[PDB]
Amino acid sequence: LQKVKHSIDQVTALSDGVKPKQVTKNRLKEYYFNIGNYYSIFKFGKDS
Amino acid sequence: VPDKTVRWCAVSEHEATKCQSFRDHMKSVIPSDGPSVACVKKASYLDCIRAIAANEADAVTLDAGLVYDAYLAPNNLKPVVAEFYGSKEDPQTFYYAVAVVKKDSGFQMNQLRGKKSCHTGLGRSAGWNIPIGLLYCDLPEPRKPLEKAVANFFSGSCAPCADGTDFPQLCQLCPGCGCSTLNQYFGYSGAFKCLKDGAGDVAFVKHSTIFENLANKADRDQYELLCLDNTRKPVDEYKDCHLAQVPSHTVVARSMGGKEDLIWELLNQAQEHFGKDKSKEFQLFSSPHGKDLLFKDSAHGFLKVPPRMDAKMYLGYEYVTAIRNLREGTCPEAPTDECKPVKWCALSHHERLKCDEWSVNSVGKIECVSAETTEDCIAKIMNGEADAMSLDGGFVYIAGKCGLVPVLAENYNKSDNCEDTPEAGYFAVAVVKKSASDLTWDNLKGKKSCHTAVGRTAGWNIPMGLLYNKINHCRFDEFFSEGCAPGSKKDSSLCKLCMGSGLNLCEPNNKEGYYGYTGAFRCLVEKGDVAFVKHQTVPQNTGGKNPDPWAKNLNEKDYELLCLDGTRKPVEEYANCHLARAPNHAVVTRKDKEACVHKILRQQQHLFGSNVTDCSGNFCLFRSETKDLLFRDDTVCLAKLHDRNTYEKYLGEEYVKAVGNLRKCSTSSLLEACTFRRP
Amino acid sequence: STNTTDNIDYFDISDESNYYLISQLRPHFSN
Ligand SMILES: *[C@@H]1O[C@H](CO)[C@@H](O)[C@H](O)[C@H]1NC(C)=O
Ligand SMILES: [Fe+3]
Ligand SMILES: [Fe+3]
């Protein structure tokens, strides 16, 4: 339950949000990899 | 908030590029649960030290001489990861400091006056402390402040980080002293460029600096480096023309908040993937837009600084004393006519009573400084806050590894000339009772075993070194069922058989009743099956020799000692049945106060030795209140050690081998920290 | 009345580096 609440807190914390029209390719990879892992924490959290 | 970042200090933006590349490349091969790097840009090294102190950043890399400026309060910074300089096969930790000069320039070391000099920093190890410390005492008065007299000594120079406002001669060859890579002559390569451009007559660097900046063998055949013996030698051989050896650069961190396990967790996964051509894309130890950024370009690996080792034990004692005398400005003359009073060391508030009574009954020649374990008082000798100790041979091996020497060695045999006679030693035995006749040295599985304390000769090293070759594994808490051995880990059964209450269980000192020889005999009488003591324990506690009642009631004949083959031989006949012959105890001290502790204890012996009768109502240094405190109670005289003053020579070959078969099983942290030094 | 437990699968173990957690629900990893 702690990992679920931390995941929701970080994602909604990113929904303020910083708005670039353009980013670097490795920055974009860091983004999709990043909040993709937050989906992995949340969807892994619900059934547990 | 990512909640697990290691902040890092960069000295310029020109290093902050390297921090950003190390951050993005180190983001990949660590998973998302692991730690990550963040970058903090501070202007100078000292502002980063204040930054880590005020909890902004967490780590930086500093030299050996700047850790001394990093642990002084209110900073309190400790080295946590040290780096290595040799090859991967034989890792070196020390490195050399040398003085490189132009060819045919016509200086030896003693004409070195008024010539423009290229330093690498103010307080860095290989560039300031060894050059100024070598040529230091030829300077005229006033020595303090050091920079005024060095500033009048060299006819202009460049030493970065020195205050150019109060001292213009230090910042003369450089335009302004800047503490970053923006100053074009900072660092090892910068001081060598201060030699190469022709403005400097001498440049003080390490040995690999001339190798790294040049790629031509003939150009290295031009430049030379000058020695201690007033000779010039070529730069290919720095083993013979080096000024001094210094410890490595370290990543400093905080002492309380840390966090050290994330620094080691980060860099340990960093040097594997990124160390030496391990990735072609990113380099940890090389950079395109500069050299020596965040690390050295001569480093090859990182090993952990042990947790016992603090700052002063990292730098050593010789180097801490040289930097401290170079700051305060003393330059001692030292002819040995009168000696200072010896600061003795004593543990745990009974030895403070007997020590202080001895401090008053002397003239004033023996003082007392306390400790709570013996392992801590050995470190307190190594720092300098105490001088002597009386240790048994197992801790004489530890303090021998750490750099102390034995001076006087306790005798036990009464004679009309015992200051001369070298005794062979005393025999270790194990003592069992007449109630149990099924016990046998071959049959020790699941029996309770009382011990003197961890690390001692007759209680731990000699018996468990013999039990180790049978049981073939390091854990002894699983072989015996229970047993009383103090000083071991609080989790073990070996801890929870002992009696010292409360919270003083397994504390290796006289807080417990069960500590010592006689306390091992107490747990043998009360709750144990076998105890490991000296051979003289049962006669000293047999038959009303102890007025304390549990030993007042006891007798000799019921307790009989056991051989190692499995038979019974009487306590009266100890020579034909013993575990091993362990050496007698010894007084240890540092190598400089050897003659003084020798002299003061020889004179101080004859007043308060065994010749003095009427002990109650007077002072008897060798007797005590049966707890065997500050000295072994059946000493006769402190024997002289001549021709044999080294732990190797004094302890003998069989005992050094007998401890060496147990050295992989040892868990004492101070031995690990002392053996960290060796490459 | 119920005196026994039927489902036991709440046991889980993590790696020594604690990087990954295994579970006994499918798909047995978060990844
Ligand atoms: C013991 O003390 C007496 C009196 O102080 C002294 O004369 C004697 O020399 C001492 N014994 C030794 C062995 O020095
Ligand atoms: Fe250095
Ligand atoms: Fe002993």
Short mmCIF file of C-alpha atoms and ligand atoms in Angstrom, two decimals, chain B residues 392-393 412 426 456-458 517 583 585 632, ligand 3:
data_model
loop_
_atom_site.label_atom_id
_atom_site.label_comp_id
_atom_site.label_asym_id
_atom_site.label_seq_id
_atom_site.Cartn_x
_atom_site.Cartn_y
_atom_site.Cartn_z
CA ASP B 392 48.50 -10.60 26.22
CA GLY B 393 49.96 -12.11 23.10
CA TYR B 412 56.40 -15.35 36.12
CA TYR B 426 53.04 -20.32 30.09
CA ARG B 456 43.28 -13.70 23.97
CA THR B 457 45.86 -16.49 23.74
CA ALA B 458 44.76 -19.20 26.14
CA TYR B 517 40.82 -15.97 33.90
CA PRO B 583 54.05 -16.56 25.34
CA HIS B 585 52.25 -10.85 28.18
CA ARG B 632 48.93 -9.93 35.77
FE FE D 3 46.75 -14.08 28.99
#
